[PDB]
Amino acid sequence: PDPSIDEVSKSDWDALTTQEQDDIISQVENLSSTGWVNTSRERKAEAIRSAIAERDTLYSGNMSRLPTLDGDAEYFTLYLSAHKIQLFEGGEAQSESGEGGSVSYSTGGGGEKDLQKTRYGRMALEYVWEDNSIAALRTY
Amino acid sequence: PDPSIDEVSKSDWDALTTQEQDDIISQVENLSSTGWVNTSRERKAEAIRSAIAERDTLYSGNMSRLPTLDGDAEYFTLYLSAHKIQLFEGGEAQSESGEGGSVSYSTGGGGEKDLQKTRYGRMALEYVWEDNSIAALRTY
Amino acid sequence: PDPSIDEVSKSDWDALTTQEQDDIISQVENLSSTGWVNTSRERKAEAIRSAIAERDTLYSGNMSRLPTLDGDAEYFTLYLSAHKIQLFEGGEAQSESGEGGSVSYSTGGGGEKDLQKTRYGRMALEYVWEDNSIAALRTY
Amino acid sequence: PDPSIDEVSKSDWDALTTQEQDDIISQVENLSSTGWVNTSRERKAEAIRSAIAERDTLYSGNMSRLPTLDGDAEYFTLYLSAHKIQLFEGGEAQSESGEGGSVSYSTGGGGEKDLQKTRYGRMALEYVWEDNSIAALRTY
Amino acid sequence: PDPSIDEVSKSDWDALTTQEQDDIISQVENLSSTGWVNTSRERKAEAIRSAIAERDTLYSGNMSRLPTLDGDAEYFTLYLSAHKIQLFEGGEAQSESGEGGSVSYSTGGGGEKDLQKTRYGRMALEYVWEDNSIAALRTY
Amino acid sequence: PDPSIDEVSKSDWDALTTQEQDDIISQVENLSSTGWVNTSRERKAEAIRSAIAERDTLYSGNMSRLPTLDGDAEYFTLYLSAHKIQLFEGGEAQSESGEGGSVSYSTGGGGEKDLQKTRYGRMALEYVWEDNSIAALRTY
Amino acid sequence: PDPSIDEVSKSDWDALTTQEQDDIISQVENLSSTGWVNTSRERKAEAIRSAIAERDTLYSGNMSRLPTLDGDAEYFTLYLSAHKIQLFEGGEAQSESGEGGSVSYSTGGGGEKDLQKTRYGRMALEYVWEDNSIAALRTY
Amino acid sequence: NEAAINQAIELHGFPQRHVKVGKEDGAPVRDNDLRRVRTIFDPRTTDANTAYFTGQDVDVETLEAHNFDYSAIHEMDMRNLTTALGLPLEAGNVGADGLGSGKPAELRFALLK
Numbered sequence A, B, C, D, E, F, G: 001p002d003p004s005i006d007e008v009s010k011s012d013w014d015a016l017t018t019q020e021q022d023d024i025i026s027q028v029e030n031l032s033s034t035g036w037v038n039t040s041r042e043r044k045a046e047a048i049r050s051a052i053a054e055r056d057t058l059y060s061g062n063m064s065r066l067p068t069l070d071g072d073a074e075y076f077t078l079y080l081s082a083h084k085i086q087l088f089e090g091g092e093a094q095s096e097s098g099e100g101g102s103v104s105y106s107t108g109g110g111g112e113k114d115l116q117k118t119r120y121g122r123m124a125l126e127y128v129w130e131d132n133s134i135a136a137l138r139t140y
Numbered sequence H: 001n002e003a004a005i006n007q008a009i010e011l012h013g014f015p016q017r018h019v020k021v022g023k024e025d026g027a028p029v030r031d032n033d034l035r036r037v038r039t040i041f042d043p044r045t046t047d048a049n050t051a052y053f054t055g056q057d058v059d060v061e062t063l064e065a066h067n068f069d070y071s072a073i074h075e076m077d078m079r080n081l082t083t084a085l086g087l088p089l090e091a092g093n094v095g096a097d098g099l100g101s102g103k104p105a106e107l108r109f110a111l112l113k
């Protein structure tokens, strides 16, 4: 996308054209084989707006003068967006059974916290020091 | 929405036009793929009013002069609203089985407390220091 | 409701008109998708009267000069009322199975005590310091 | 492939011809017997682009003057790409059942973190000191 | 094979004739009773190339002046190749069920790490000091 | 067999006649009631060659001037060969079910390491001090 | 049998007449109610030869001047032979099911090591101090 | 050695306050957050009888004064220097056991004379 997801603030997302937003939505949909095609545009837009807001408020600033967003800000925001869409879908699937066909996934026991609860959030955590408190300051 | 959910107090919510409330209700419905379409408007309105009141009474003020609502206040209130609607619906579904079709979700073991019990509450906890006691004061 | 549930003592509840009570009952019914429609009016009234009494006797007074009901008193009394109605209905449903259709909810391991045993009680606990003993006094 | 995946940064990937990218995609598809043939090209491209960005941002630099990427950089980026494609596919399969036929794989209990959650990520961890903190510095 | 797998670097593998590569592939296929016959040549070639690269980058050098590859280098590389083909096949099978017939294997609880996860990797570990840190150095 | 399996180095195995190798293969096949008859000659030959190499590289030398191969070298190499053929067959069978008939065996998951994983490897361990570190040296 | 199994070295076994070996084989076959009748002569002969070799190499010599084979040497070698034949049969059965008929044996959880894995090996352990280290020496 | 002792006294001779913020495995605390905590616990504005009121997730740790025998290092330095320059150890304002009296003292003062 021309305006990249990391170049866009919450205010900027609201100002983008429908096509500029749709390009970012299209990129987020590349992170799932299903594309979350049965979830409507508004829900995907809400997830991306929420991920942008959450990057800028919870994953901004510094620890010991290191940036708290250590990884690529583009892919962090995309993984955070994908995490949100998957939570809007009801969570991460452990088992799916249909017309005889069944699959179980190795997703269990990931931990209790928000980002630990889906595969996209586990990927987002690596960009952000795994939520560790590396901050330090001095008196002068 | 024009009056954003974070601009609105409990008193202000009661004063909004029906359309102003419906815009906020519509925004909350974006946080689930189902939109909770089988819950009536009054239940969604009650959840939002409750989330507004609970933000202003339980998730306000300061700890060590840092604001207790550290994250984006709009998305915090929307997630708190979504948490409430999902609890009014009976809680978070772990397994669903229908006409042959079955799904199980990675959801269990999250913890004993209110906000830990659904995915929206787990998201809301990240905005509010994860309910940690970071407050400090001095004598002078 | 015009007389709000937090403005009403046990004596006041008994003095209210039938319509004033019905307005409060209607507000409690907004806290479940089912509205507990198969539970009679007398049972909903008994639960609300009991929540009012229990607020004023068990969840009143101060700890270290802080009010023990720290959260919004209206929503606290409504959640306490809803907790009671759900207990009159046999408790929180973990699994429901019907004509082929089955659902299981994330509810287990909540804890041993009264308010921990349903979703509404877990919400109510956040308003009352989570039943913690923060009280302190001095000699003079 | 002529431009090898380890020679290509995020900017370079975007600059490659379609055939140059398709050669690298073809190499990644060799790491699964299924080739992930039901995933579209855009999803495989997104995974590879993301693996490149993540190598350059999270798995780069030095610890005690040793390179953090100790293993072969080509195979590291390919395994990281394969890890991402398998997460876009819904995660690692533990059990698969079809028309009578069933298989269960040894996968579970691998750990909570991102790279531990699929076989390709477990391979990628060996190339990068298994995420251990071997860094040391002196004052002069 | 005339050029043995231990005599071949990653650069050398790419330079071999198709027949020379096929002889090494043929040898790796002897390590499974199935020979991985439903996995294509390119995938077996990718596994062998990856095993060669990984031997030379991760399983080379010395610990206390002892070689880190203590066992036979040919068989270590063949087992590492077999480990990779089995991971490309989806992992180690614990249970298989078909038309009536079922088998379960003793494979579980082997550990969290890459080489622990299949029988070939467990064999390969014995050649490389079981991934133990026996290295020692002096100052002079 | 005339050249015994303990008299033969990896180089010697390659030099043997087809009949001399077949005599040793026939001896190994006596260690299973099934004789692994559905595995081809090349796989059995590869297993014996690998066992010979692994004896000479991993189970040669001394600990406190005691030989590290304490038991009979012929039977050690035969059990090591049998261990390999069983791993090439997919592992040790815990349960087998067919046309109504079922058997379960006391395999019990004896440990995580290579030789612990099948009955033949458990026998082989007894010949090599159970992989214990009995070595000692002096300075002079 | 005239040459008793305790009178026979590995070299002696190879020199015995077919009838002398068959007498010892017949004695070993008395230790199971099934006689292992579906195993061939060569497999029983291999097991006996291996038990003889293993007695003489692993269960010979002294600890604190006490013989390490404390029990009756004939029955020890027979039980060691029976242990080996049962391992060639695939191991000790825990459960057997046929045409409706099922039996489960109290054999489970026996231990990790070779001789602990079948009933014959558990009997053999009692003859060899249960594999304990009772050896002691002095300086003079 | 004198320069080393002086620098070591500054780093290690005095306790230092270590305020640790947040729960272990809790929410991460960032630099701007620690600036506000620094303002509350500033040793510049603190007085001897300041009292602290906190939640459970603030810890006031101490870097202790770490023991080293700088006096013994000074004595060894002074012994090395005085014995090298030929003066008795007493000239360096350093005393030593048994040497201060009797024929031991007579010998050392005789050597000086």
Ligand SMILES: [Mg+2]
Pocket (backbone or CB within 6 Å): A113, A131, B126, B130, H026, H027, H028
């Ligand atoms: Mg967090």
